[PDB]
């Protein structure tokens, strides 16, 4: 039979532009807000509204229509949902990138640790390709442990020219598990965990020119977007619910992990809402971070693997796209 006729022009894809979602884009693009970690109502007859298998996200059955586009399984491409995270969480695939960006800018004002006043930095900023420019900047900036509120003038080293700074000592950043821990040296060194909110706030203060020199794009990818605040929910087609004999229903591994994310998010939201001493909050944050990290990548060095009831490791998105049998 084929797909129905469409009035839109028929065109060929010419360019592909990669980027990162903004939190506003995920909320605007999404058609429904997921707030229930269930999939079927109490009667197990129809999918519960607001659940993982919300009818608004599309249909994967030959007998049901999509509540959004009113089209069958063979025409609906799927509609994305979104989950409003209680607290920002790191992106598992950008933790290394986040660490390099943190060491490149001051952790109190969001300004580059080295300005154009340094000859070595001047040549680094002259590099055209972004990937190598970022590496050169990181090498120069990662060894600067102070903001240098005042810098010697370039005309001569006698007088000092004032530059935007705070004179605040920078920490030595290391990655422990899924958390970034910075250590300050005294005038044993003090150690504390850098909260995801603190990193997000610092990243939002980086000037437009500052992170462009780091290889980021003002519109397509900004450092603030590398921290997840709103999580898009893939539609049922991406995570179909297979059946063995049509009398027993099975759910995709993504649905199992997504349900855990909803349960963890609600648990964290309820905790901090009333009581919940700070010790419990950090444990709840770590659990949410672990669930999200394993959802996108279940093979993380030094971390436990999210295992299924049968004992098989959960098949995350990274596993699907990688390997000889992967999507590519």
């Amino acid at each position: 039979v084929g797909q129905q006729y469409s009035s839109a022009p028929l065109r060929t894809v010419k360019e592909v532009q990669f980027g990162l979602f903004s939190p506003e884009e995920v909320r605007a693009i999404s058609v429904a807000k997921i707030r229930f970690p269930e999939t079927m109502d109490e009667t197990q007859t129809r999918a519960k509204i607001g659940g993982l298998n919300d009818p608004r996200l599309g249909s994967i059955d030959r007998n049901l229509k999509c509540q959004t586009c009113q089209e069958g399984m063979n025409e609906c491409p799927g509609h994305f949902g979104h989950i409003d995270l209680a607290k920002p969480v790191f992106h598992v695939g950008f933790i290394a990138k986040i660490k390099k960006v943190c060491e490149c800018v001051c952790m109190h004002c969001g300004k580059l640790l080295l300005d154009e006043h340094n000859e070595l930095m001047r040549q680094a900023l002259a590099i055209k390709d972004s990937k190598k420019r970022f590496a050169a900047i990181w090498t120069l900036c990662k060894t600067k442990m102070v903001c240098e509120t005042d810098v010697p003038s370039e005309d001569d080293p006698t007088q000092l020219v004032s530059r935007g700074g705070c004179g605040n000592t920078q920490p030595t950043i290391r990655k422990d598990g899924l958390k970034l821990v910075g250590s300050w040296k005294k005038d044993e060194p003090e150690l504390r965990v850098l909260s995801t909110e603190e990193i997000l706030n610092i990243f939002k203060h980086i000037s437009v020119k500052d992170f462009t020199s780091l290889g980021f794009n003002e519109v397509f990818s900004r450092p603030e977007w590398m921290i997840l605040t709103c999580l898009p929910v893939p539609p049922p087609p991406v995570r179909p619910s297979i059946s063995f004999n049509e009398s027993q229903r099975g759910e995709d591994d993504l649905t199992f992990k997504l349900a855990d994310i909803l349960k963890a998010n609600i648990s964290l939201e309820t905790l901090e809402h009333n009581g919940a001493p700070h010790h419990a909050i950090e444990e709840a944050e770590s659990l949410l971070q672990f669930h999200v990290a394993t959802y996108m990548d279940n093979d993380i060095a030094g971390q436990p693997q999210a295992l299924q009831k049968s004992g098989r490791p959960v098949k995350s998105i990274r596993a699907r796209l990688k390997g000889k049998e992967g999507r590519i």
Binding site: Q67, Q70, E272, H273, N274, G275, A276
Partner: protein, 156 residues
């Protein structure tokens, strides 16, 4: 629950130091800004809601409970030009219940401003005067011991 809610609104500040002990105090610059913004936001929210309600009501479908605006309904009417037919349900549309609320929202705004009058008067005087930001050490200058033998060492 009381501290957590009063902490989210930043009307009460927390300070943790090793003696890990937890101390609570009031940060005047933070509380005033939060009160000033929330009061402005609350008034703005009512004003925006009143403005929105002054617009035509719209339409809704009794079956699928889908909101349809005046413009959206105009493209869904039947070929006979007699009733608005729902795209999903192919059923006549029913007018929404938002016509009489126009007066209710206005009344609430009028009552709220009279009740919030002392806050507005206090804020005007606060901006006129010079506000000094408080700190734990500064707050210690006005310390009244709570107990004769309090376990907490009120020192910085």
């Amino acid at each position: 629950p009381l501290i957590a809610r009063l902490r989210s609104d930043r009307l009460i500040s927390i300070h943790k130091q090793r003696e890990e002990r937890v101390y609570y105090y009031v940060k005047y610059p933070h509380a005033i800004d939060a009160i000033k913004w929330k009061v402005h936001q609350v008034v703005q929210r009512l004003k925006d809601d009143l403005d929105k309600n002054s617009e035509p009501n719209g339409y809704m479908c009794p079956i699928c409970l889908t909101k349809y605006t005046q413009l959206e309904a105009v493209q869904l009417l039947n070929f006979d030009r007699t009733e608005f037919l729902c795209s999903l349900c192919d059923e006549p549309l029913v007018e929404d219940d938002s016509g009489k609320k126009n007066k209710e929202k206005q009344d609430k705004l009028n009552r709220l401003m009279d009740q919030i009058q002392p806050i507005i008067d206090s804020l005007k005087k606060i901006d006129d005067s010079r506000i000094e930001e408080n700190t734990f050490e500064i707050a210690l200058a006005r310390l009244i011991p709570p107990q004769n033998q309090s376990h907490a060492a009120y020192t910085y």
